[model samples]
Structure formats: structure tokens, C-alpha cells
Target: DVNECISNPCQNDATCLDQIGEFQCICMPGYEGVYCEI
Candidate 1:
């Protein structure tokens, strides 16, 4: 029940959405993948 986004796992200037025991990455334009590494 903590904020996972605090670690800033997203890459390429992606946005990190904090969820319950999970997290989601909103990749920026021209970016893809789970962590937006693409």
C-alpha cells in the first residue's frame, strides 16, 4: 500500500502512475514498452 512511483521507474520522461502494490508507466511520444525503454 505504498507509492511505487517514488523510485521513478519510468524512462524517457515517462509518467509514473502509483497504484496499490503496483505501478503503471505512461510513456511519452515515440516511447514504448513496460518501462518505456523502447
Candidate 2:
């Protein structure tokens, strides 16, 4: 399930949101990076 998302391999600060079963970086307008770390 969620492991498959990570297994496909995201990039540039992406993270596995396992509860939602998805990969996300979630940059806002002009944010241009990881939401949690940048």
C-alpha cells in the first residue's frame, strides 16, 4: 500500500503520507520546497 508509493521513489524532499496512502511534498505558492522541512 503506502510502501508501494515510497518504493516507487519520490524526490526533492517528498515524503510518504502513509495514512492517506500517498507521496507529497506540498509546496505552497512560491514555497518551492518541502512543507515540513522548508
lDDT of each: 0.74, 0.46
lDDT of 1 by residue, 1-38 (tens): 44576777877777778656657788767777888869
lDDT value for model 1: 0.74
Residue 35 in model 1: lDDT: 82
Best by lDDT: 1
lDDT tens digits by residue: candidate 2, 1-38 = 34545543435445445445444554334545433344
Candidate 2: residue 11 lDDT (0-100): 50
- The lDDT, on a scale of 0 to 1, for candidate 2 is 0.46
